[model samples]
Target: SLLRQCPLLLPQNREGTAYEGFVSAQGRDFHIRILLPTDSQLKNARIECSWHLKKILHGYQHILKQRLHSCPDLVSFVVELKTILEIALKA
Candidate 1:
């Protein structure tokens, strides 16, 4: 379902859980790196991105950190990210 919405996000490892790519939103391209949790453990995944995003999402870092570890899955996180970015850019 996520892949259908954003084909730019491609799997990086054999596990197919880790993804690296850019997401387009609010006329900006955010180079994002998403490492989803493994089947055995679902709490250590990390999400990274370019400097532009870092600056844009500065105040929202804490929120993202929380979501990165708490979100159910990558697809949900990506959706959440788009929503956040859109709101951040809008305001």
Candidate 2:
């Protein structure tokens, strides 16, 4: 359902391919890079704008929040991930 709405953010598999580019919003360049996983991993196989990429989506929080609003699954996933990252960084 989510991918059906925004296929641009679809997850990629080893036998598959993807595209990468920038989505300009409010004078900000939100870079989107998706690297499909190799033939080894099964889950969490897609890379969506690594934090190491340096604020690639700096002003795109609203975009993500909008998506989360439309997709319940995505919101749940984000909450869990945010919790984990928050705890991990507090150490």
Candidate 3:
């Protein structure tokens, strides 16, 4: 959102029309890949992330239909995830 540059996230590849980047949080970094294709574009896009995150958000599909739909942008969504998860972990 801000032009000031958020070093927390950085793009990884130019391989496709989707997004490929790694987001750092809680002193650890995880890879995230977002596919804009819509075999089900009815409301959502495809998003794939590190299996390392698999433990924390394994049921991603549940919210896959929610969060990503309401997210303002990719960068913004993840920054919020930092808090979402930290609390999720604590709870």
Candidate 4:
């Protein structure tokens, strides 16, 4: 799987095995938590988000100040997200 091949996309959490972290854009903060779907779920192209996933993503959307009309490709989004996270963490 792409995530297995690239572990950087996975979040780091000391609290538990769950992947989670906070990201910032334009000096505003956004929390993100991702739970990988099961193998069967992936095979069926159905993803299940954690209880907080939608709320966190919603917070991110508000930080943008405007909704995006469309989503980016997964690869592109991952690359950019990783880059920004690195920068965000260093600060």
Candidate 5:
């Protein structure tokens, strides 16, 4: 069945890994738990943070805004991404 094919769907390790995903709300917040691969090295490494892409996106947006303000073009955005990626890869 589908359950057998997708073990990550299960709550228990009987299947996959689970993490909580969240998005910030002006007044209230809502979140849900999702299952991903247990061996996920990058994105799957941290459950709580991995699921909260919205918050991450917001912060990244703020940084991009600053970069754009100083240099209005795709170059700034690409530079930011390259710098971050290099740091991450080095670590």
Candidate 6:
């Protein structure tokens, strides 16, 4: 019932919908096209990649790289991960 009661959180369901996604390597970027119904109003919307997560992700990856030898298992990584990840999820 909770799921049914919740709003459709996807932007496509909102008015003035824009849908876009992409990947970036180094500083360059590449876009991915979605296959959707031509009749869907969401089809023409622009979906921009949210890069804010990328900044956090880059730090996460770098921390793993540096700490792997000290803590090979996920325990330490998760401890560090929780400090920011929970806030991120809530956001």
Best by lDDT: 1
Q: Which 10 residues in a row give candidate 4 its minimum summed lDDT?
A: 40-49
Q: What's the candidate order when arranged by decreasing TM-score?
A: 1, 3, 4, 2, 5, 6
Compared with the true structure, what per-residue lDDT tens digits does model 5 show for residues 1-91?
Answer: 4333222223435444433323212123324233335363322222222222343321222333333332422223223433433433344
Candidate 1, superposed: residue stretches over 4 Å from native? 40-42, 53-61, 64-71
How well does each candidate superpose onto the true structure, as a TM-score? 0.66, 0.29, 0.49, 0.32, 0.24, 0.19
Each prediction's Cα lDDT score?
0.58, 0.37, 0.46, 0.36, 0.32, 0.30
Instruction: After superposing candidate 2 on the true structure, give the runs of residues whose Cα lies further than 4 Å from its correct spot.
Output: 1-15, 23-26, 38-42, 51-91
Per-residue accuracy of model 2 over 17-82 as CA lDDT, tens digit each: 332443111123434454535454323334355443465433223333422332333424333333
Q: Candidate 5 at residue 35, lDDT? A: 35
Tell me the tens digit of each residue's lDDT in model 6 across 15-81: 3222223322223332321222234442222322335433222222233343333342222322333
Angstrom error of the Cα, residue 69, model 5: value is 8.4
- Better model by TM-score, 2 or 6? 2
Question: Cα lDDT for residue 5, model 4?
Answer: 32
Candidate 1's TM-score:
0.66
Candidate 1 residue pairs in backbone clash = none
Off by over 4 Å in 6: 1-74
Q: Least lDDT summed over 10 consecutive residues: which range in candidate 3?
A: 55-64
Candidate 5 residues lying further than 4 Å off, grouped into runs, are 1-56, 61-70
Cα displacement (angstroms), candidate 5, residue 3, comes to: 43
